[PDB]
Write a protein that binds this ligand. Sequence first.
Ligand SMILES: [Zn+2]
Lengths: 55, 193, 267
Amino acid sequence: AKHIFLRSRAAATIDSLASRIEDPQIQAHWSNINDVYESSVKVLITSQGYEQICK
Amino acid sequence: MGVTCVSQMPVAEGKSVQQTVELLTRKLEMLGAEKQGTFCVDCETYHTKLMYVMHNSEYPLSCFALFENGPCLIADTNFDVLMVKLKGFFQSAKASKIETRGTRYQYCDFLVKVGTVTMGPSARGISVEVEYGPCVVASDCWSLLLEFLQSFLGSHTPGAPAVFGNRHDAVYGPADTMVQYMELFNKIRKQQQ
Amino acid sequence: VSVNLEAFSQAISAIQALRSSVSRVFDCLKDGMRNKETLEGREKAFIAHFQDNLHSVNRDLNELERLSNLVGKLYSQLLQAYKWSNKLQYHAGLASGLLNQQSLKRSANQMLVLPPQYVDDVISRIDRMFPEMSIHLSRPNGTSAMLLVTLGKVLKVIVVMRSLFIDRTIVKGYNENVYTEDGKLDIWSKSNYQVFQKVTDHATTALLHYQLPQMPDVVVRSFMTWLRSYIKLFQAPCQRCGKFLQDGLPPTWRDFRTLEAFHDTCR
Ligand SMILES: [Zn+2]
């Protein structure tokens, strides 16, 4: 229950980030294989036009 | 398991046996190492062929049974049940309580078993033992243990253990450290005092 | 053999340098005098240059014998068609260029399926050398391949791939049950060691460092080459702080493009 609630809270934070800040861009990606307790997610906040340079 | 260095240091003209032990512990507290509890290694000999039927508090299930120089049986409880039945092939040979009693300390996965040596009730020595956890292969990390020895011992810094002469590239075994302990017991039992 | 054929070069140059230097000794003393205003700037320079050229001859003579000590020891028509194939090897190096890997890439924005046997052929190419390490490929869960690697008597590593690309990599020691109770490879766990957990972060930074958008084979090859330096762990001191232990930690962090053990503080 704590794992599900904490994932929901992280989703709430990233949704606040997405709705509040659309300036550079927002990207959220999740691992297709997951554990019962711990997860691994990827968060990207990269600029609008020249993302391929700022790696 | 991990690579171990075992040695003696005497009273060394300062007060008593445990004064230098307390000096080492306060030096380690200056470094700031936490404890993990206590430890004691107890020995007992038997003969008809000298049987070293011996124990360690780190692994109480590990009942060590050695010759004078042959193979070692790190055996279970039922071996101790079988050992009683002979009594004529292998006599008791009492009064062999040469023990090392002390405490263990931890500093960032580093372990120290430091204490004093007693012939039962009477303490006549100081056992110094340093070790590291993840030391899987032997004779590859002796620079680390030498640096650790010169870090806080100062005087009486040892080197070149007897089981290091037993050169092999496999995993270090608790029998090696155990061997070192019985060689330590042979070193201390001669002087008595 | 070519060690003597290239060690002879210094001596065959040194004897001609001896001839040239003794010719200089002859003609500079034979040149007479060039006063250049003051005499004290000439006559005191006379002994200076007379020591200079004679001592140059002397040192040339001297370095001759230390090179001489180290050294040791249809008829011509079809010989001409032999070495041209050997200079064609230089002709192969003629069009190489030093531009190499580095390019001038801009943003890649405008204005797939591969069999697992290809992954097996990929992993068979580099496992053939480095016999001290082993590779055990397995797919008990889907077509994705996760591999067991033993490193002599030191390390046991699980290396998970997915979609022919990298998924994950976890390293443990040599005396632990890397399998589960069922016998399958463990997926989600921890190494239960401070140094190992510390260097798993370095591994995660390294996998996001080797970035090839099309060619992940060199990514994983550079990754395992980087990992090959980690069989020297607990055996090499740090390159800047001298001692092994930085707050009790031996050097582990190999720098990018320069593989030598460091710490986070040691950079
Ligand atoms: Zn360092």
